[PDB]
Symmetry: D2
């Protein structure tokens, strides 16, 4: 094959520097990019009307927590709406995030769509006009992006088509992002839905990630200028067999070691349906796993960082401090976890 450089040494340096800042030691990502329709259920759980002002206030609550969170948060992912909102002091949210040492991220996908001829499988859309959108988001303060692909473990899934198609679209998205100085976070989420066991999740995860990286290679993606946001390897949500955190950690680390090139700057785990504590304990076990890990192993949590804060807030302005306190607590717990320093108080078998 013949090379036709997609990026200059300068463009590579910019992307690599951004990627490294996000996952620097002890730092993780706050995923606060829920759309109106996705955060609707959260607000209704606390009897709070889903208005623009309430969403702005809640986001402000998280983004303006005290400096204790600064060394814990390397990046914050925002939804389009939030990227253009301002704190009470008039400061745009991207400025608020940057001022606390964090990198600003932006969700750019346009949701999943059904793959015809499959058993309920999907791919993700959002490539149309993505380059122009990225160029604008960059000018407006964003340095990295989010794009979520969803795969499911079932009797006949994920199918060959679902794997190939989702891997290909993630590569297209990544390619467009890098052309605009935006670090793409590649997110091939394999849902925990089902009664499958740990070994099954590990197998599927290994096959999906192998497909993802081959696609990234085919599309000339600069891995040093990317991050990976995969599901941890865990048994199905309804699996009858139970496992220890150490087992989940070994399965996860083994899967990654068998598929993720050392060149990838970092892995930022999604928490799925895990509770706040569960997500932190598992991430800690992952970092304590006695196998060599050539990439940062950290977090990109949404609910796992906001669950208690949202509840403490309750939609009441007078609970601002209490709510932010809960967020800080989880930010500190996960910052410790991504270093293997968190305390709540036979690899050949994989």
């Amino acid at each position: 094959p013949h090379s036709h450089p997609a990026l200059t040494p300068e463009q590579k340096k910019e992307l690599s520097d951004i990627a490294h800042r996000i996952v620097a030691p002890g730092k993780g990502i706050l995923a606060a990019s829920e759309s109106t329709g996705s955060i609707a259920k959260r607000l209704q759980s606390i009897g709070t009307e889903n208005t623009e002002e309430n969403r702005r206030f809640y986001r402000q609550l998280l983004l303006t927590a005290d400096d204790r969170v600064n060394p814990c948060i390397g990046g914050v992912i925002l939804f389009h709406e939030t990227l253009y909102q301002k704190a009470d002091d008039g400061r745009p949210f991207p400025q608020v995030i940057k001022s606390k040492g964090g990198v600003v991220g932006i969700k750019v996908d346009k949701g999943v769509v059904p793959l015809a001829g499959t058993n309920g499988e999907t791919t993700t859309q959002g490539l149309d006009g993505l380059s122009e959108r990225c160029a604008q988001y960059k000018k407006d303060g964003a340095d990295f992006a989010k794009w979520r692909c969803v795969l499911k473990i079932g009797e006949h899934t994920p199918s060959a088509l679902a794997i190939m198609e989702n891997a290909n679209v993630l590569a297209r998205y990544a390619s467009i992002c890098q052309q605009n100085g935006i670090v793409p976070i590649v997110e091939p989420e394999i849902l925990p839905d089902g009664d499958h066991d740990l070994k099954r999740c590990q197998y599927v995860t290994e096959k999906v990630l192998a497909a993802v990286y081959k696609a990234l290679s085919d599309h000339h993606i600069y891995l040093e200028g990317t991050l990976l946001k995969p599901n941890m390897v865990t048994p199905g949500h309804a699996c009858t067999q139970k496992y220890s955190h150490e087992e989940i950690a070994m399965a996860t680390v083994t899967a990654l070691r068998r598929t993720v090139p050392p060149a990838v700057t970092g892995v930022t785990f999604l928490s799925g349906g895990q509770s706040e504590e569960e997500a932190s304990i598992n991430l800690n076990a992952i970092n304590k796993c006695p196998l060599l890990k050539p990439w940062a192993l950290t977090f990109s949590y949404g609910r796992a960082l906001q669950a208690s804060a949202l509840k403490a807030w309750g939609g009441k302005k007078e609970n601002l401090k209490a709510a932010q306190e809960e967020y800080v607590k989880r930010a500190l717990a996960n910052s410790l976890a991504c270093q293997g320093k968190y305390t709540p108080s036979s690899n050949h078998a994989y």
Copy 2:
């Protein structure tokens, strides 16, 4: 694998019926889906302001040509704007087309975009919200669609990435169309640009089509409910070697016989940069080629059907009949050509 029927028997019948109607014996397609920007150059060549009214009048001029074009035109591809315009008498253009026995088509792609890391190669965008658009277009009169992918022959092109990506996006577009009762015309155009010879075009065409059909299979596409719009196999525009129309025909038919499944309902050739007469003479030779052809071999011409008509019109309403006469003559010529009855006045070597 396991079958999860993308289409029901009823949906298949609808698509197959539409596809067969468009390429019925003696019929072809008038490709009049030029956008404001793509038609600008041609309107300029005749010193005519590029306004919606002049565009409507020009399209009206073609769509309302006399009844002689009825048995020649099986389908008419329109640009979005035109699908919603009406003739002077108040009849919506789709109605005008149908009343003359033609099927209405709609361009649904959103143009080409550059593929990073390649030598000026592209893929095509337009998948976002495509399903909803197809459902709307279907309700508004369209029964088939157009989506153009572009490949170029050069020292290092078309590359593996370009072939794979364009084939994959064509399959996604095809799948979405069929879910909405729209027959997708798969258009993997290989540009005639360059000094390459006939055998090189044939080789590249064979490899591209093989990739296209494997992708359609992977995406569970119903071939009987599709049409193919490929380039004819010809030498590059700058090639110094000369060839007869019979050689062009043999190379073209051999390439198709080696890659296009019999199930494909029809092949509607694009004319590229060929003149009106050249496009007709070649299509005629293709249909007279001794080899067995299991699919209709017809036309989907834009410039090859409008060149003389546009010039005769010159933006002058008083030239209406003169302009239509030119279009009618090419429609008649190509109807004869797709039957191997048009007259202006060693196969192992492939």
Copy 3:
């Protein structure tokens, strides 16, 4: 994206001419390339010792049938041993076959091997030194070759790996053959084992054939100089739902129309476990299917042509004529079937109605 011609116009012409001769109108293939281990069970069924002489005698019985079979047989596939054996008159079997207007074929694969990490799936070996073997076989009379890949329909099969690997090895085999003037018969057999229905077999067959032709394209195979030997599309041998011959024909022709390029010279169906009569009736229905079929649709039968003959012989040299007559009868039936002109309504032994199905061990 650059062409480096694998074959010259002359080489292409030779391959195309051979392929067309094999499937010329009314003609089919006699698959008599069974190995010693396979023919042994056949000879045992009739209390006949499995010796080289008995095997030679049996093949001679089929190859020397009267001239009525000449118009019916376009090609005969032989096992290595048989290619070098001679009839009682001293004539090498290849010469015997050729003198009757038939093309000589040779089995070149070395059997199936297990694909690790799969649920009992396999791929096929035999590429090592294949070029030299083909060159020698060509000199010794063979003009086409046989190579069998095997796939099975189940809950997890055929898997992505099984399909990809088998399609790739078939392509390598085809490439090497064409470099030596040998027409390769591409055989991706999907076993009838299981209780799946007609539509499931059709689905799998379509996916497998799509993979096969994409691989052939990737390996620069000259399709006009090849033949395809696929399973007919039918329900699983244990399927409860019953189907008519017309439905089997429609499903078969539809699957082929959706995957096999018109350039492929011909399709020579394997009979699987179908009885002699069933194989003839289905082949006939296929040729009568209303859909457009741009390739010859004929047969490449082994057991489906030999069942009655093997029984009539019984290992007794005295039953020579009797046995050959049964073979000639099936050859004539299939010759008419591959033309859509076969109509039973007559004297067809019960042996021709017996299921020739054998579970994959």
Copy 4:
């Protein structure tokens, strides 16, 4: 999307343990699996008859070097003939190797064959009956195998077909080996022939390795029980532009970091046409490269370990010691190099890639 375990935990443990022993800190591989026809050139350069006895004497010369090579040699690749020969004392060569702490390897491919429709490209044969051959070799003392695929950088190569086909055959070979307790060394050699520069080699190497590992994944290969034998990333032999060892090391390590999963136990570099000293300097530079390397980076040298020994020997029994001393010196040098501790004296912008 369903797993059907190709290997049990015990089988995986055996393969992983073998792989790790071969590339343990400070150890590399002596590649002495040259066939009769291949070793013919070497013997003629020193005017020595190519007989089984001469080949045995030469192989014995390398295999029986003094104990100084023990901590340097983790594995020795033998040709079929040699696996069944014996030292003067009657000890089978596999026993001699094992007694010195080395693992015994065996070449199992049957050479390259031309890929029709390509510009002189090839694939490699040898899968037929490979399982039976592996079981027999395992029984006779071998624990790992060698299989060489060859690709070339040219105007239109390596082509898509060549890359896909060689990657697929390497996967089949690896799969069969692992079923028989044999650790397969995956060798996708990209020849240094041509005038291409360093970045072109790096590009091609990256694309080839990506295809190789995708194939291994598709074939369910246990990476921890495998080793990789790639070309170092270097400019073509006819390249007019010159590069330092640091640049060669950066390009090489960068290419590997972008394609080789950390699960792969080790990388054993082939030296190609590099001189003995050059091969050691580059390997040392590779190990000193300031980037994270999650796998052992060592050697699997043939000529780079035998060049001087062959010449010193000259086919004269009286030169045994002199010849063995040359081999020992290169074994020691490379042992230091695969630790980044090599020095001529003896025992004493990354974004632009």
